[PDB]
Amino acid sequence: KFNGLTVLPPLLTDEMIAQYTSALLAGTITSGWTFG
Amino acid sequence: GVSVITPGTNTSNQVAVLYQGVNCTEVPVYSTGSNV
Ligand SMILES: *[C@@H]1O[C@H](CO)[C@@H](O[C@@H]2O[C@H](CO)[C@@H](O)[C@H](O)[C@H]2NC(C)=O)[C@H](O)[C@H]1NC(C)=O
Ligand SMILES: *[C@@H]1O[C@H](CO)[C@@H](O)[C@H](O)[C@H]1NC(C)=O
């Protein structure tokens, strides 16, 4: 992949996004619209 | 590529160097000795 150009890595890895989604989903299960 | 991280000119004059897309076995005051 080394030809004169590079690919930068993403700032947030997959576990980060998974944990955000789990937090949002647990919040909407328990609280509802209040936590917004 | 090489990037520099600095906390600001007004506060200090110390920077941290980040070498992108390289494995630390051929990198060579910033050569060795310091924290890698
Ligand atoms: C950077 O290079 C070193 C040395 O080539 C890599 O160390 C190897 O690590 C693997 C996995 O533990 C071992 O099977 C090899 O035997 C190691 N090499 C030697 C020469 O002992 C290291 O993994 C490299 N780093 C990256 C991020 O690729
Ligand atoms: C230097 O800049 C920083 C910006 O984060 C500021 O917080 C700090 O007060 C500044 N100090 C001086 C001496 O200007």
- Select from A29, B22, B23, B34 the least CA-distant residue to B14: B34
Ramachandran region, residue A34 (left: φ > 0; alpha: ψ -120 to 50; beta: rest): alpha
Q: Which atom of ligand 1 is nearest to the CA of B24?
A: 1
Q: What is the largest CA-CA distance in chain A?
A: 52
Amino acid at residue number B28: P
**Exp. method:** cryo-EM
A8 chain-B contacts, CB cut-off 8 A? 20
Query: Which H or E element spans position A20?
Result: helix A14-30
- Select from B32, B34, B30 the least CA-distant residue to B4: B30
Instruction: Identify which of B6, B10, B12, B13 to mutate to test ligand 2's pocket (most ligand atoms within 8 A of the CB).
Output: B10
Q: How far is B21 from chain A (nearest CA, A)?
A: 8
d(CA A7, CA B2): 14
Query: Which H or E element spans position B16?
Result: strand B16-19
Residues B6/B15, Cβ–Cβ less than 8 Å: yes
